Amino acid sequence: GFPIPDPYCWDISFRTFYTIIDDEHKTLFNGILLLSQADNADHLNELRRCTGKHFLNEQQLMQASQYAGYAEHKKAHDDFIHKLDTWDGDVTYAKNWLVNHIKTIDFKYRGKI
Amino acid sequence: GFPIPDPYCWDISFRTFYTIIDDEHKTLFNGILLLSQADNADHLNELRRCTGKHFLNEQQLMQASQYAGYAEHKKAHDDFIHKLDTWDGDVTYAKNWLVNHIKTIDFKYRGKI
Amino acid sequence: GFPIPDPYCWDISFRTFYTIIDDEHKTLFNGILLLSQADNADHLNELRRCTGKHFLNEQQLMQASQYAGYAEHKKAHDDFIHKLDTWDGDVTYAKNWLVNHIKTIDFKYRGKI
Amino acid sequence: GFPIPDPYCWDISFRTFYTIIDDEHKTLFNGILLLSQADNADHLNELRRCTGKHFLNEQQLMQASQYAGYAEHKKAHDDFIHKLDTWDGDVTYAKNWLVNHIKTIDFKYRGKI
Amino acid sequence: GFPIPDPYCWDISFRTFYTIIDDEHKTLFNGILLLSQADNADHLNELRRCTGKHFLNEQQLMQASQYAGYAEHKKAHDDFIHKLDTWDGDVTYAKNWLVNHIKTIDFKYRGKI
Amino acid sequence: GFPIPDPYCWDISFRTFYTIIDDEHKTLFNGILLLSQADNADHLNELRRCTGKHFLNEQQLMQASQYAGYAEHKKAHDDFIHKLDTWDGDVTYAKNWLVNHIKTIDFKYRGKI
Amino acid sequence: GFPIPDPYCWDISFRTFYTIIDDEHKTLFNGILLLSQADNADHLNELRRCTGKHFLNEQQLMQASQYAGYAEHKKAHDDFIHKLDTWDGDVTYAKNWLVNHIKTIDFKYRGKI
Amino acid sequence: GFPIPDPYCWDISFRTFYTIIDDEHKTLFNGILLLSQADNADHLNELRRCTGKHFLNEQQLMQASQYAGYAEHKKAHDDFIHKLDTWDGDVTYAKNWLVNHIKTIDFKYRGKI
């Protein structure tokens, strides 16, 4: 269980050392930051697009090395997409989800993909 | 319910702001315009090729961000392909279909893909 | 002197037999038709973007087979860009230039690239 | 003079309508925010990598449509890189430079590339 | 029912006007020509590789425009692969099959893909 | 049944004449060599990543020419992945498996893909 | 002096072990055989397109490994293009030139690219 | 002065954190080990191909982020190629050069590209 950065922006503690992945993650941080300022549709579309794109790219990256933890990782991703598709305004959940997802599930593939 | 441009050619009111998508749409406008001048096989092949290519590309673009409205959008596309594969010479239907498809279904993904 | 279509849209007489080239060409017809409707910045941008992109892509196709007429063709394209970048509103010139460019200069690469 | 966001993160007012460009831009906001938190080599590397990559990619997008403002834009980008390669810690300059670059120089290519 | 070229090499009567497709077809002609000179394994491997590659590429090309005649065309291809995988030395069959396949089935997609 | 190179590193007797394939194989040799020095997780992750990547790439290469021996070859690959996912420290098995796999199963596709 | 095949088609003695290169080479044999049948513009176009494309692609393969014989090889290719661009109908020269080019100059890059 | 591995193979101390770079580096260790076993043309070709390809690819990675140390790094690589193109059999030099190149010059781009 990890601290929540305030302002809710990416920092180097989240580095995975996959620069594409890090740069995509910076966009998910910003997406949740916007929602945290104004819970509207422009902001949710922005987070949703970036989330869908990042999860699919990262999924491809895992598949390229036939990663053993893919299926568990894809199921995590798909549950979060689902929250976003039924958004409830729960920004705290999202701030939390992303921090733990990166620092636990994404950190797990390092060196394996 | 939108006006039908006369001559039946693309205009900037159809811009989606995805330049690839706009350029592909210009070819569907021209395809229906040819048919409207001469309902023959060279012209239907031309529209059919451009339609099949555009729908698949746009479908890929939607898939890249895991778009929530994909399945409804693909079903729309597939119904129109089907009309083209059983062409009946109904050019008015086609002039209409395309205008509404862009201005309603395609305009819906803007900002999300 | 080739006939100028009316409406100024692409027709199958312009076919080069390269489907990507033909699809790009349709966007150049459309750009000149919009300017003929309203000589403004939006329309000139649309045409200028599509012209720049088509000229570059067709140049790349030429280079891929080390086409012997490349230099002369590139020079023809660059001269038209200049005209678009110093636009004086002469739509008639543009309408003519495109019809003659396709049917005499683009048609000469058929079978060689 | 445009307002400087606080927190210094991207917002939808910076939208260019090119999703890849906007996603890159978010990483430049983030790089300058990290430096504002701690002026060190890690943070400067992160910003400098993301700036180098975004400038190159946006230059390639410009070239693909033979954008007429390419030279001047490239020169603006190269001048900023120089500032990053001779970094003196002036975060205020950087914060300003990015906001003005996006809203005045990047915004001028919209519709042309 | 078409003539069999002697020597069994491609000629311009087989042009489909898809240069990639034509160049791949030239390799199938050569493959059958080798077998016709020496029915051995080096020669069958050579034809088999080129055949498998060409059929898959051409299948992709058909899929890119959602070609209506794909399934019939793929079934043709797959039957010929199968003959090659159970080769019987019947070179006349192969000389024949290829000529008709191109001039009837492949000529059918022209203008549609 | 082939000799095991000592030191357990690739040599030109393993050349398949597909340079991509050879270069990937060099990484599997090194992976087993590390494990042979220290049976730890950094080393198994390294072999596992390289193995998964190589098997998928080689599988793609086979698929591109519709290789007849694909399914048998993929089943071989998938069994070895499975050993690696349930590693038992049996380095001798692995030194052996790889030598025979290349010199028998991989050597079989030469000239066919 | 290597033997000149009759019919002037590629055979497995010309194998370079690079499947894309060998497949391109087959199209150069074919281009010279067509000219030997009928010295016309169609045939010369076919050969000239395939020669330009093969020379460029093989040059790109050379460059990808920073091949030390690149300059000399490129010069050999450019000299042949010149001969095709100043075509005098000397098919015998062409037949010889290709056999010697492959077996002495192309064969020297084997294992180095 | 860094230690020279024995056997002269890559180990995880050489990790750059760029998986493609690390996989290429393994092929350079292998090339120098083969030469240490037998100083012949086959082995020198293998090393020289892998060195040329790795240097080019790593140069392209550097350029993609407009890496400020590009020029100096390229010069280091070009000097080694020269040594390989004027090979005198000094394997000791090579063994040293690679260890120092990776651990001092390649390591300096980490986080910047």
Swiss-Prot record, chains A, B, C, D, E, F, G, H:
Gene3D superfamilies: Hemerythrin-like. It comes from Themiste dyscrita (Peanut worm). Keywords: Iron, Metal-binding, Oxygen transport, Transport. InterPro entries: Haemerythrin, Haemerythrin_Fe_BS, Hemerythrin, Hemerythrin-like, Hemerythrin-like_sf, Hemerythrin_metal-bd. This is Hemerythrin. Hemerythrin is a respiratory protein in blood cells of certain marine worms. The oxygen-binding site in each chain contains two iron atoms. PROSITE patterns: HEMERYTHRINS. Homooctamer. Disulfide bonds: none annotated. PANTHER family: BACTERIOHEMERYTHRIN. GO terms for molecular function: iron ion binding; oxygen carrier activity. Fe cation 2 binds at residues 58, 73, 77, 101, 106. Fe cation 1 binds at residues 25, 54, 58, 106. Belongs to the hemerythrin family. Transmembrane segments: none annotated.
